[PDB]
Amino acid sequence: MKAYHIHVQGIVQAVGFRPFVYRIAHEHNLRGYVKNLGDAGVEIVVEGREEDIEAFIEDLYKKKPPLARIDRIEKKEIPPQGFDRFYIEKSSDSIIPPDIAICDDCLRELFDPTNKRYMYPFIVCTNCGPRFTIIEDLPYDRENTTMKEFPMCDFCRSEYEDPLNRRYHAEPTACPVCGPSYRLYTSDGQEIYGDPLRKAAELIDKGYIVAIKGIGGIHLACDAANEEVVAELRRRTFRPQKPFAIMAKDIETVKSFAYVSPEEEEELTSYRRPIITLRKKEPFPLPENLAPGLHTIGVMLPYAGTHYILFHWSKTPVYVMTSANYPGMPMVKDNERAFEELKDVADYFLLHNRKILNRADDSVIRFVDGKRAVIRRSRGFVPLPIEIPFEYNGLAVGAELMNAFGVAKNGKVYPSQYIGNTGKVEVLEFMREAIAHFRKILRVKNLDLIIADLHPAYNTTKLAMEMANELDVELLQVQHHYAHIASVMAEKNLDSVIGIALDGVGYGTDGNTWGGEVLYLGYEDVERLAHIDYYPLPGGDLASYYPLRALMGILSKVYSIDELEGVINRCCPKAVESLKYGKVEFNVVLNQLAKGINTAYASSTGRVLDAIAVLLNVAYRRHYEGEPAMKLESFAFKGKNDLKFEVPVEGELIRVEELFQSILEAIEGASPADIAYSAHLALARAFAHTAVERAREFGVKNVALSGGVAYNELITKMIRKVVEANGLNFHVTTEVPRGDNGVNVGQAFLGGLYLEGYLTKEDLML
Ligand SMILES: [Zn+2]
Ligand SMILES: [Zn+2]
Ligand SMILES: [Zn+2]
């Protein structure tokens, strides 16, 4: 014949490519074959005519499997010693794939009459649908997945078997007959089979709220359009401000609903269907209830059969999807618990047979100036790895809040699902199960040690110990901030580099509540650099909770005891700790502060900026995680004339307090917003500028921002920008999240390095 020895390599092997190459071939009737060698050997000999010799190579790009991106194609030229009457996939390393959203094709298939799965919720092809959330354990096989309880009906099998058909070997395949079925409940009571689905939505728009059995953990739903009902929900859940998550029909709806970014629309239509957060249009459309004091809004698009179909009816597009579980508990899997927890919470229920083994909270992502990073690693990512410059089988618990344990081997770390806040015992036990599962796709008796935040009180590290004492495995802790900063040089794959850490509450080395300082990740003998003049805050935890408890502590570093009294009078935030505790009495606590009796030393940028959020008309008592930092940002955006502040930087200390000083001296004249906006850049600019100077006086080409207060667009904008008068820097991107959640990754590449011996056994402790 007259073909071309096309040579491709990069993503083909592991993922499902053979099934694709086969179909695409026969479709163009171009008989040939696709050889296979291994992790690096899959060519294609499409020997045939010309009107198709091109179509094949042309389609391979625009039609390749989802979890795959062609990387190499060399049109060679070799004649087959024998023409090809049939196309063959002659063969001779499976990898747990993540949960993908419905494929553009299957969509039409269900959303349209002609098909067998006409309006079938559990629709799916071999190029999408659920995976991890229902993969019992490798080998990846039907007989070994949640879909096992469902024997395939003849019709399907025929397809499942046939190669040409896309549903080929689609383990999680089904139909309205052999496939699972939906149902409608209401704190008990129900109908049967398919009568529900349709009606289900007729209620979501009706006003009432109803939970939905997602693919990786069911969650409450509600018409985000009815300001009335949405508010109701916030009560049955005891959640006052946490930015709810909405789900619009098509991208269009998202537009008039708010703001659509360029590569954003891409990140949305992604196979992961994450909950991005884009600015809401000035003339607020949806009820201001969905999320107060926040320019952004949780946006979601349909992601699996039931979604699109459910969206059909209900008239109103925008819905509302949030972890169906009391504030503090993880998603509810077993329908059993669905009733034993939301009997009062939700109004109705919509569950299905197919059990959701592993939990999987929806992944949320928000873009920043420099690039586009995420915050919640889960949903459609896990269990996809990230490369570590070191090989060592080990576990890494990580932070305690917004945690995400990890495990690596050969040189790749594994970020788990959003194990939420390891606080409540409910959570703790959850992690154990997750780790157990992960360990079933890896090695037992991990030939290597563990990792945990340098805090001897985290329900996380708590495990690290008992776990260490178990199976007899060495234990190792590491600074919290040295992690966020490490999570960068691990994802960007590089060597020691200066970086800025701005977290809300980090267990710094030496009982020092860090959260604002630049460090040097020098491979050898690592050490701290810049810093903030520790400010006195009453109640380590209390301070974070009640803002005024910190606003005072920081003003003492510039004002006297009785002085702090007057300055506070610049506003009236006393009635804050009054709606949840005593008021005057709190101010009386000033003694505890003045006398320096009971006081813990901090340096968190989150708190610093937090105080500024109360030293104004912004916010008061914290209602969840990072409420001020965010509330203060949004408010700041509305500022035009960028004022010019300049938080000092002496030797290796930042008199950030002096910032407040000047801040107040401008209130009498400068608009309210312009202040929040100004201080934002100011605090950041002089904060980064330091990292810069230090880089030069230490021979380093680049720096890296990361940690809690890292998503602040205003700050991240200036900071990274300042690095323009130096060397190209980088901040954690989509792959890994700068936030706490992605701390384990930083730990893995960090502690794992310790084993290597390239790091001192104690330059992580002290
Ligand atoms: Zn599909
Ligand atoms: Zn079937
Ligand atoms: Zn953190």
UniProtKB/TrEMBL annotation:
Which BP terms from GO are recorded? protein maturation
Which positions bind Zn(2+) 3? H480, H484, D503, D740
Which residues does the record give as Zn(2+) 2 binding sites?
A: C153, C156, C178
Keyword Zinc-finger: yes or no? yes
Bilayer-crossing residues are: none
Q: Which PROSITE patterns match?
A: ACYLPHOSPHATASE_3 (PS51160), YRDC (PS51163)
Q: Which GO terms describe its molecular function?
A: acylphosphatase activity; carboxyl- or carbamoyltransferase activity; double-stranded RNA binding; ligase activity; zinc ion binding
Q: In which pathway does it act?
A: Protein modification; [NiFe] hydrogenase maturation
Cited InterPro entries: Acylphosphatase-like_dom, Acylphosphatase-like_dom_sf, ATPase_NBD, Carbamoyltrans_HypF-like, Carbamoyltransferase_HypF, DHBP_synth_RibB-like_a/b_dom, HypF_C, HypF_C_2
Main EC class the enzyme belongs to: ligase
- Reaction equation(s) it catalyzes: an acyl phosphate + H2O = a carboxylate + phosphate + H(+); C-terminal L-cysteinyl-[HypE protein] + carbamoyl phosphate + ATP + H2O = C-terminal S-carboxamide-L-cysteinyl-[HypE protein] + AMP + phosphate + diphosphate + H(+)
Binding of Zn(2+) 1 occurs at: C103, C106, C125, C128
Active-site residues, Swiss-Prot/TrEMBL: R18, N36
Q: Domain (YrdC-like): give its ranges.
A: 194-380
Q: Which Pfam families match?
A: Acylphosphatase, HypF_C, HypF_C_2, Sua5_yciO_yrdC, zf-HYPF
Which keywords annotate this record?
Hydrolase, Ligase, Metal-binding, Zinc, Zinc-finger
- Origin superkingdom: Archaea
Residue stretches making up the Acylphosphatase-like domain:
3-90
| The EC number(s) this enzyme carries | 6.2.-.-
Q: Which family does it belong to?
A: Belongs to the carbamoyltransferase HypF family.
Q: What is this protein called?
A: Carbamoyltransferase
Organism of derivation: Thermococcus kodakarensis (strain ATCC BAA-918 / JCM 12380 / KOD1) (Pyrococcus kodakaraensis (strain KOD1))
